UniProtKB/Swiss-Prot annotation:
Cellular-component GO terms for this entry: cell surface; collagen-containing extracellular matrix; cytoplasm; cytosol; extracellular exosome; extracellular region; extracellular space; ficolin-1-rich granule membrane
Full-protein positions shown: 113 to 250 of 250
Organism: Homo sapiens
UniProt keyword list: Acetylation, Cytoplasm, Differentiation, Disulfide bond, IgE-binding protein, Immunity, Innate immunity, Lectin, mRNA processing, mRNA splicing, Nucleus, Phosphoprotein, Repeat, Secreted, Spliceosome
Motif (Nuclear export signal): 114-129
Span of domain Galectin: 6-136
UniProt signal peptide: none
Protein's recorded name: Galectin-3
Subcellular location: Cytoplasm; Nucleus; Secreted
GO terms, biological process: eosinophil chemotaxis; epithelial cell differentiation; innate immune response; macrophage chemotaxis; monocyte chemotaxis; mononuclear cell migration; mRNA processing; negative regulation of endocytosis
Domain of life from the UniProt record: Eukaryota
Function: Galactose-specific lectin which binds IgE. May mediate with the alpha-3, beta-1 integrin the stimulation by CSPG4 of endothelial cells migration. Together with DMBT1, required for terminal differentiation of columnar epithelial cells during early embryogenesis. In the nucleus: acts as a pre-mRNA splicing factor. Involved in acute inflammatory responses including neutrophil activation and adhesion, chemoattraction of monocytes macrophages, opsonization of apoptotic neutrophils, and activation of mast cells.
Gene: LGALS3
Length: 138
């Protein structure tokens, strides 16, 4: 187990068939979780579970370019529960990131940042106890 915030290096960036697995437990009374796939200061893919946005649970995804957030993609399907162990899997495909939680498909996010081989860091932050962060090629 690791203390958040945690930075997982992605040397030479990401590539199709790369499967990133994040294991942990959501804290009790969690407010937020964030995964940030970064290309330098740009955030290619921000994955942001919010547990109380106007008393609703929502997944927010976005990209940050030149320090500016773009158009949010939102999902009401919310597989996380406070206090419970989770597995987030991000599968890199040619045209999108595919996300599954606890072995159930959640969403896809089309690549806005095109240079996959420069997306060289994954930041993990928010209201979790982080057990592990690793990747493999499927
Ligand atoms: C409150 O900041 C968040 C941003 N955010 C979260 C974290 C964050 C830090 C620490 C932790 Cl531990 C953690 F979990 C975290 F989510 N940092 N930045 C990020 O979630 C962003 C996603 O779109 O939304 C917000 C910023 C934002 C959105 N927008 C609009 C458009 F441009 F997107 C939507 O109408 C205009 N303008 N600004
Ligand atoms: Cl944090």
């Amino acid at each position: 187990p690791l203390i958040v915030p945690y930075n997982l290096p992605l040397p030479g960036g990401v590539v199709p068939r790369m499967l990133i697995t994040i294991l942990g437990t959501v804290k009790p009374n969690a407010n937020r979780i964030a995964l940030d796939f970064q290309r330098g200061n740009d955030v290619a893919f921000h994955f942001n579970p919010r547990f109380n946005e106007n008393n609703r649970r929502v997944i927010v995804c976005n990209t940050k370019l030149d320090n500016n957030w773009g158009r949010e993609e939102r999902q009401s399907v919310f597989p996380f529960e406070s206090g419970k162990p989770f597995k987030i899997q991000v599968l890199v495909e040619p045209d999108h990131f595919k996300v599954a939680v606890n072995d159930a498909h959640l969403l896809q996010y089309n690549h806005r940042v095109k240079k996959l081989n420069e997306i060289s860091k994954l930041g993990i932050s928010g209201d979790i106890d982080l057990t592990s962060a690793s990747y493999t090629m499927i």
